[PDB]
């Protein structure tokens, strides 16, 4: 596992977020189901704990995107960049932008799981970056699986970060 | 398939 650099984290355990965008692939309720189930994927094995919120700044905002899409950090159509993550952090730091020129599903199709890209970018929005361990969510490829469970490399690099539940 | 530079700084 590893971490940004200075390792930045979050400085509390409650942690917001809001979804500010949708996208035409998915009915809301599947995209708000896929978001959450990939905020447990860490709230299981951290002191971490997420909430929805539907006004204002939330810590970590989440929207679809196309090109450039407000940040300087433009998506790039189908392929390439399928979505990306800021580092924990003010502002910015946190938010997850999803690229809408990708096919979300979960995981059929010439497409991609939002649930698996989702659990992968709140990742780094958390403070991890990429694992040289292949089997980890933080490792830099997307392997799409039916029944997935958090690695032991991740579970320990999230860890060493927020610490476990009590 | 790769993420690419997914991973960025604020
Ligand atoms: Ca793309
Ligand atoms: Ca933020
Ligand atoms: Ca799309
Ligand atoms: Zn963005
Ligand atoms: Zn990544």
Same mark, same amino acid.
């Given at each position: 596992?590893?971490?940004?650099?200075?390792? @930045?984290?979050? *400085?509390?355990?409650?942690?917001? #977020?809001?979804?500010?965008?949708?996208?035409?692939?998915?009915?809301?309720?599947?995209?708000?189901?896929?978001?959450?189930?990939?905020? !447990?994927?860490? =709230?299981?094995?951290?002191?971490?704990?997420? =909430?929805?919120?539907?006004?204002?700044?939330?810590?970590?905002?989440?929207?679809?995107?196309?090109?450039?899409?407000?940040?300087? #950090?433009?998506? *790039?159509?189908?392929?390439?960049?399928?979505?990306?993550?800021?580092? @924990?952090?003010?502002?910015?730091?946190?938010?997850?932008?999803?690229?809408?020129?990708?096919?979300?599903?979960?995981?059929?199709?010439?497409? #991609?799981?939002?649930?698996?890209?989702?659990?992968?970018?709140?990742?780094?929005?958390?403070?991890?970056?990429? =694992?040289?361990?292949?089997?980890?969510?933080?490792?830099?490829?997307?392997?799409?699986?039916?029944?997935?469970?958090?690695? !032991?490399?991740?579970?320990?690099?999230?860890?060493?970060?927020?610490?476990?539940?009590? | 398939?790769?993420?690419?530079?997914?991973?960025?700084?604020?």
């Amino acid at each position: 596992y590893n971490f940004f650099p200075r390792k @930045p984290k979050w *400085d509390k355990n409650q942690i917001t #977020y809001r979804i500010i965008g949708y996208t035409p692939d998915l009915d809301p309720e599947t995209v708000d189901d896929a978001f959450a189930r990939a905020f !447990q994927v860490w =709230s299981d094995v951290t002191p971490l704990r997420f =909430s929805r919120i539907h006004d204002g700044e939330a810590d970590i905002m989440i929207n679809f995107g196309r090109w450039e899409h407000g940040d300087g #950090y433009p998506f *790039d159509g189908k392929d390439g960049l399928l979505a990306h993550a800021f580092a @924990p952090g003010t502002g910015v730091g946190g938010d997850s932008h999803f690229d809408d020129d990708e096919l979300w599903t979960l995981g059929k199709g010439v497409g #991609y799981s939002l649930f698996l890209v989702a659990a992968h970018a709140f990742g780094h929005a958390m403070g991890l970056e990429h =694992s040289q361990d292949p089997g980890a969510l933080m490792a830099p490829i997307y392997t799409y699986t039916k029944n997935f469970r958090l690695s !032991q490399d991740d579970i320990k690099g999230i860890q060493e970060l927020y610490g476990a539940s009590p | 398939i790769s993420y690419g530079n997914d991973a960025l700084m604020p």
